Design an enzyme around this catalytic site. Structure first.
Site, PDB file in Angstrom:
ATOM      1  N   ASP A 208       8.395 -10.789 -59.474  1.00 33.74           N
ATOM      2  CA  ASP A 208       7.511 -10.628 -58.273  1.00 33.74           C
ATOM      3  C   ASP A 208       7.285 -12.089 -57.719  1.00 33.74           C
ATOM      4  O   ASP A 208       6.167 -12.637 -57.808  1.00 33.74           O
ATOM      5  CB  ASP A 208       6.119 -10.065 -58.651  1.00 33.74           C
ATOM      6  CG  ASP A 208       5.418  -9.342 -57.475  1.00 33.74           C
ATOM      7  OD1 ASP A 208       4.343  -8.733 -57.683  1.00 33.74           O
ATOM      8  OD2 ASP A 208       5.967  -9.327 -56.360  1.00 33.74           O
TER       9      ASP A 208
ATOM     10  N   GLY B 292      -5.313  -7.403 -51.682  1.00 27.60           N
ATOM     11  CA  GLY B 292      -5.527  -8.399 -50.651  1.00 27.60           C
ATOM     12  C   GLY B 292      -5.392  -9.810 -51.209  1.00 27.60           C
ATOM     13  O   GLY B 292      -5.035 -10.802 -50.464  1.00 27.60           O
TER      14      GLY B 292
ATOM     15  N   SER C 119      -3.024 -10.565 -53.587  1.00 28.65           N
ATOM     16  CA  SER C 119      -1.683 -10.708 -54.101  1.00 28.65           C
ATOM     17  C   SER C 119      -0.930 -11.835 -53.480  1.00 28.65           C
ATOM     18  O   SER C 119      -1.227 -12.169 -52.356  1.00 28.65           O
ATOM     19  CB  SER C 119      -0.813  -9.433 -53.947  1.00 28.65           C
ATOM     20  OG  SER C 119      -1.312  -8.357 -54.656  1.00 28.65           O
TER      21      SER C 119
HETATM   22  N1  239 Z   1      -6.896  -6.193 -61.041  1.00 27.82           N
HETATM   23  C1  239 Z   1      -6.337  -7.204 -60.342  1.00 27.82           C
HETATM   24  N2  239 Z   1      -6.456  -8.530 -60.592  1.00 27.82           N
HETATM   25  C2  239 Z   1      -5.423  -6.855 -59.261  1.00 27.82           C
HETATM   26  C3  239 Z   1      -4.287  -7.686 -58.800  1.00 27.82           C
HETATM   27  C4  239 Z   1      -3.332  -7.359 -57.810  1.00 27.82           C
HETATM   28  C5  239 Z   1      -3.508  -6.104 -57.215  1.00 27.82           C
HETATM   29  C6  239 Z   1      -2.637  -5.662 -56.190  1.00 27.82           C
HETATM   30  C7  239 Z   1      -2.736  -4.469 -55.456  1.00 27.82           C
HETATM   31  C8  239 Z   1      -1.752  -3.984 -54.503  1.00 27.82           C
HETATM   32  O1  239 Z   1      -2.196  -3.261 -53.603  1.00 27.82           O
HETATM   33  N3  239 Z   1      -0.424  -4.184 -54.704  1.00 27.82           N
HETATM   34  C9  239 Z   1       0.681  -3.747 -53.949  1.00 27.82           C
HETATM   35  C10 239 Z   1       1.865  -3.539 -54.662  1.00 27.82           C
HETATM   36  C11 239 Z   1       3.047  -3.205 -53.978  1.00 27.82           C
HETATM   37  C12 239 Z   1       2.923  -2.898 -52.607  1.00 27.82           C
HETATM   38  C13 239 Z   1       4.122  -2.348 -51.871  1.00 27.82           C
HETATM   39  N4  239 Z   1       4.098  -0.901 -51.754  1.00 27.82           N
HETATM   40  C14 239 Z   1       1.712  -3.029 -51.880  1.00 27.82           C
HETATM   41  C15 239 Z   1       0.569  -3.508 -52.558  1.00 27.82           C
HETATM   42  C16 239 Z   1      -3.896  -3.756 -55.822  1.00 27.82           C
HETATM   43  C17 239 Z   1      -4.813  -4.032 -56.856  1.00 27.82           C
HETATM   44  C18 239 Z   1      -4.572  -5.222 -57.545  1.00 27.82           C
HETATM   45  C19 239 Z   1      -5.467  -5.620 -58.541  1.00 27.82           C
END
Ligand code: 239
Length: 245
Positions: free
Chosen positions: A97, A196, A198
């Site tokens: 990633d 948000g 990421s």
């Molecule tokens: N618990 C965390 N630190 C954490 C850390 C990172 C996180 C990322 C997403 C997220 O929405 N990810 C995502 C993954 C792939 C795509 C593509 N479909 C879109 C969003 C959601 C929740 C998350 C939670």
């Protein structure tokens, strides 16, 4: 960021705010990133894989609020979007990633360092900090998992790194988390990154030097008990980062 504190860009000047323009003109916030050299921002391939057209993105350096044009900010388009060729997504775990964004202004320039725009150093091969180390994360992500709006002001928090053997325990992530990945969390489960955030930085001070140890990647919920945040381990990818820049 659940919990933590409000902050401004002079305290995190390597942070990149990344947005996407939609057909019809509106622009919305996508993910964070980090400046590693004047022309190169590094982030997470999952933020881009479903919209892989480099023309769609807007990257700001020097920006402290989601909707205000902070003094001293700089705005850029993406000249090359490089996604890792063996990226893939399981139910929770995301693999390779990692993404590179080569940035250029409308005049064709990279960023110009200043008090509010700076690079963050890469790690060395085989040397990441020991489990238990405190590291900082930053972003414009959700303040609670029930929110649908993101916070107008940038936030940060501090979390501790968790070993590969603890993170692979049955009530944490089992064999879903691999040796290319690093876990970190609050021992009291009250603060974390969240949707948000990421692509944004996990910065650890290591042997004196502030270092981009990880990239926000995935997790089960936000600030949920026994469910750490999981981060791409940047030292493993040093041969891919040098060959693609
Ligand atoms: N618990 C965390 N630190 C954490 C850390 C990172 C996180 C990322 C997403 C997220 O929405 N990810 C995502 C993954 C792939 C795509 C593509 N479909 C879109 C969003 C959601 C929740 C998350 C939670």
């Amino acid at each position: 960021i659940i919990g933590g504190e409000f902050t401004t860009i002079e305290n995190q000047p390597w942070f990149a705010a990344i947005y996407r323009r939609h057909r019809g003109g509106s622009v919305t916030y996508v993910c964070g990133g980090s400046l590693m050299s004047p022309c190169w921002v590094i982030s997470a391939t999952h933020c881009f894989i479903d919209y892989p057209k480099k023309e769609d993105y807007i990257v700001y350096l020097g920006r402290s609020r989601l909707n205000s044009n902070t003094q001293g900010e700089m705005k850029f388009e993406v000249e090359n979007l490089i996604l890792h060729k063996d990226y893939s997504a399981d139910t929770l775990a995301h693999h390779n990633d990692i993404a590179l964004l080569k940035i250029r202004s409308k005049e064709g320039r990279c960023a110009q360092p200043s008090r509010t725009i700076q690079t963050i150093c890469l790690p060395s091969m085989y040397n990441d900090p020991q489990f238990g180390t405190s590291c900082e994360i930053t972003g414009f992500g959700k303040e609670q998992s029930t929110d649908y709006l993101y916070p107008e002001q940038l936030k940060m928090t501090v979390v501790k790194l968790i070993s590969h053997r603890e993170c692979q325990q049955p009530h944490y992530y089992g064999s879903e988390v691999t040796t290319k990945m690093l876990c970190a969390a609050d021992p009291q489960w009250k603060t974390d990154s969240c949707q948000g955030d990421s692509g944004g930085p996990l910065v650890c001070s290591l042997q004196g030097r502030m270092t981009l140890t990880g990239i926000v990647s995935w997790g089960r919920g936000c600030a949920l008990k026994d469910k750490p945040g999981v981060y791409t381990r940047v030292s493993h990818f040093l041969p891919w980062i040098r060959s693609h820049t």
